[PDB]
Amino acid sequence: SVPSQKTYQGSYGFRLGFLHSGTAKSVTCTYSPALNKLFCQLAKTCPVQLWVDSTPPPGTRVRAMAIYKQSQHMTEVVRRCPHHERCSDSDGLAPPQHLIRVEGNLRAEYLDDRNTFRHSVVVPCEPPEVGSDCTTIHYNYMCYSSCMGGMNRRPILTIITLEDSSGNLLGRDSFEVRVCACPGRDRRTEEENLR
């Protein structure tokens, strides 16, 4: 089966936000609003903001999952390639097969779905710190889009879901991701191509 990617703000007005990082050749993570696409280097911090109109209940969680973007591949589980799943770069919490990790959250939980076999990582939501109006989650992508025997140059989407304590849907958003050596250049190129 294939997880839904339908944008759904839900009762709390859930949506993502991204920093404005620019397209300098030295940039490690940059987001294109025109393409709804994140470009990032391997295993580098990707800040993603979580916005709501009103505070959800205690016990609310936020889950990230990757799927292939192209319909002929959507049924295939997105996983790390045969090289990176064996390179012993574990943080002690993420299974070595998972593409997406959460950085710096000891309450992160990693799921291997007993039925779909798809991978995801989920963390508890906490309301914003004093003075701030949103929260930020830091993601890492642990394979290149180009990795042979893995994503193999196929585009992926990240689906972010806001869930209640049972895992029921409260909200959903998504963005395309390219994990690459030069995010600044590739963003500039793809935005030019779109023009």
**Residues of each annotated binding site for Zn(2+):** 81, 84, 143, 147
Contact call for residues 7 and 172 (beta carbons, < 8 A): yes
Establish if 79 lies at the interface with Zn ion (CB under 5 A). Answer: no
3 contacts which partner out of ligand FY8, Zn ion, none, CB within 5 to 8 A by kind? none
Burial letters 69-85, b for 16+ CB under 10 A, else e: beeeeeeeebbbbeebb
Establish if 81 lies at the interface with Zn ion (CB under 5 A). Answer: yes
**Spatial distance between the Cα atoms of 159 and 185, rounded to a whole number of angstroms:** 25
82 contacts which partner out of ligand FY8, Zn ion, none, CB within 5 to 8 A by kind? none
162 contacts which partner out of ligand FY8, Zn ion, none, CB within 5 to 8 A by kind? none
Residues 105-164 that bind Zn ion (CB under 5 A): 143, 147, 150
Establish if 40 lies at the interface with Zn ion (CB under 5 A). Answer: no
Q: Which stretch binds ligand FY8 (CB under 6 A): 113-121, 133-141, 164-172, 183-191?
A: 133-141
DSSP track, 22-42:
---TT-SEEEETTTTEEEE-T
Q: Which stretch binds ligand FY8 (CB under 6 A): 47-55, 81-89, 107-115, 170-178?
A: 47-55
Reported as half-sphere exposure (CB side, CA atoms, 13 A), residue 78 has a value of: 30
List 169's β-bridge partners, or say none.
163
For tokens 């949506």, the residue is: 15
Shortest distance, CB of residue 153 to Zn ion, whole angstroms?
12
143 contacts which partner out of ligand FY8, Zn ion, none, CB within 5 to 8 A by kind? Zn ion
**Spatial distance between the Cα atoms of 176 and 158, rounded to a whole number of angstroms:** 6
Shortest distance, CB of residue 168 to Zn ion, whole angstroms?
33
